[PDB]
Amino acid sequence: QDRDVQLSKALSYALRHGALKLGLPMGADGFVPLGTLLQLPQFRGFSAEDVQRVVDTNRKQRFALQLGDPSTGLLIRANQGHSLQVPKLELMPLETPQALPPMLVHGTFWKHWPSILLKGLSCQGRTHIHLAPGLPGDGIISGMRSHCEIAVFIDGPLALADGIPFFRSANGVILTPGNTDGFLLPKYFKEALQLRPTRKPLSLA
Numbered sequence: 605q606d607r608d609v610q611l612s613k614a615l616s617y618a619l620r621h622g623a624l625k626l627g628l629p630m631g632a633d634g635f636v637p638l639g640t641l642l643q644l645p646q647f648r649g650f651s652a653e654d655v656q657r658v659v660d661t662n663r664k665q666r667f668a669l670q671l672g673d674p675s676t677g678l679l680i681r682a683n684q685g686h687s688l689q690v691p692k693l694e695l696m697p698l699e700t701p702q703a704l705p706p707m708l709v710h711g712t713f714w715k716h717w718p719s720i721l722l723k724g725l726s727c728q729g730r731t732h733i734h735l736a737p738g739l740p741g742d743g744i745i746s747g748m749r750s751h752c753e754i755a756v757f758i759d760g761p762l763a764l765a766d767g768i769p770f771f772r773s774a775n776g777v778i779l780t781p782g783n784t785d786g787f788l789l790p791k792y793f794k795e796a797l798q799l800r801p802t803r804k805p806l807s808l809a
């Protein structure tokens with residue numbers, strides 16, 4: 605079972621970040637033949653049904669699978685979170701404020717809170733900042749981690765008014781490249797909320 609946890613992690617890294625360094629033949633849409641991946645050293649211990657299990661029982665739908673042809677087999681991608689340049693990846697462009705989700709919200713942790721207040725939310729390594737289109741139940745909402753302590757909400761219409769684009773992934777995640785350096789500046793911060801161990805509001809600028 606942990607092997608499924610290990611399979612997902614190895615799948616996440618290879619499909620999101622390390623593929624052109626691993627030799628895999630990935631297209632500009634982020635799709636790679638699954639067999640060529642399962643031929644890699646770290647993947648040689650897994651079966652196409654193991655990967656199939658991880659793809660369907662995954663609650664965040666991190667990976668998409670496509671039939672392909674028999675000469676290539678199944679095509680497998682990650683839906684979001686890429687360090688690689690995949691310009692043709694399936695993304696819904698949220699170009700007007702009326703297409704945006706009800707609320708944009710990023711959940712993070714105290715260790716990073718002072719840097720976010722002073723520099724803004726950063727893409728960090730990834731190509732897009734990851735936001736949720738809502739808060740979760742007592743919930744696994746995709747686009748947000750599970751053990752977050754504080755959540756900060758984003759003013760979507762104001763960011764768009766300043767030419768900061770937004771995108772929706774095929775698994776419900778909202779993405780933005782930020783500004784030039786990959787930062788969502790603290791001006792587009794509308795509201796903040798501490799989540800654990802008690803729901804309390806947090807102050808900003």
Ligand SMILES: Nc1ncnc2c1ncn2[C@@H]1O[C@H](COP(=O)(O)OP(=O)(O)OC[C@H]2O[C@H](OP(=O)(O)O)[C@H](O)[C@@H]2O)[C@@H](O)[C@H]1O
Pocket residue numbers: 616664666685711712713716719720723724725726727728729730734746747748749750
């Ligand atoms: N200026 C700043 N200074 C200091 N820290 C800053 C900062 N700006 C942001 N940070 C924080 O630095 C980390 C970012 O780095 P990351 O992108 O890898 O973290 P994330 O949570 O966004 O992860 C994305 C998806 O990836 C996973 O999806 P999976 O389930 O693994 O498939 C997740 O669940 C998500 O859905 C976060 O803590 C940021 O708050």
